[PDB]
Design a protein around this ligand. Sequence first.
Ligand SMILES: O=C1[C@@H](O)[C@H](O)[C@@H](O)[C@H](O)[C@@H]1O
Ligand SMILES: [Fe+3]
Ligand SMILES: [Fe+3]
Length: 241
Amino acid sequence: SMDRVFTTYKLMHTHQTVDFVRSKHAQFGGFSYKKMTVMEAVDLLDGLVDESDDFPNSFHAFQTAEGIRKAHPDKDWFHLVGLLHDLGKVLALFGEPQWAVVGDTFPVGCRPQASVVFCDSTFQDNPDLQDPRYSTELGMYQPHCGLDRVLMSWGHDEYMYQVMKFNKFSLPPEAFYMIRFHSFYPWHTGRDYQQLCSQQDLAMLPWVREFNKFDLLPDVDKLRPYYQGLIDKYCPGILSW
Ligand SMILES: O=C1[C@@H](O)[C@H](O)[C@@H](O)[C@H](O)[C@@H]1O
Ligand SMILES: [Fe+3]
Ligand SMILES: [Fe+3]
């Protein structure tokens, strides 16, 4: 598998510190990079190949949405979750390097656990891992705080979650959560990070695993009007990114 995939994660696991994530929350927390509609966001990602993997990520938006739609035909909000879920990748078009945008996510501020991809080979130069506040199992966290109180590595999950919240998308809470934690492989697949999750995360786990099935070229022009209706329904108009 790619040397580029490995290099993406090496850079990610070096530079994603507590300070770094906090800096990125400040940098993007104003939503003044762009005014654009959801469909513009989808089309912008025509010019993005995901280096943590090939085709444009935009096709993947439709593919995912259509996979969910086949399996859950009467659940329109869930089809849209498919379309929306990787649109935080617009960060890359905003000048962000891909280790700060794509890839599996992991909590910052506590020791990385075994199922964090390339855990053994990629954390050497992370400065946080010699800081006694962050080098331990729990790090800066209290036991069983819940994932919504964890500071995750920064990229397309928290970013899109924040875009949705700011713009007041009218999706159910499960839709927000799926998107926010869909890259958190160590938790939803590795079953790591049990020290941090709560009952609330246990309730959400079946939703995330169900979504992940469809995350893991279509005739996209024919699909546009349907997905436009869903956008009009759940997240209409020019949004702040
Ligand atoms: O959209 C994505 C891609 O970046 C995949 O390569 C990751 O493995 C996944 O964790 C993430 O959700
Ligand atoms: Fe993703
Ligand atoms: Fe995806």
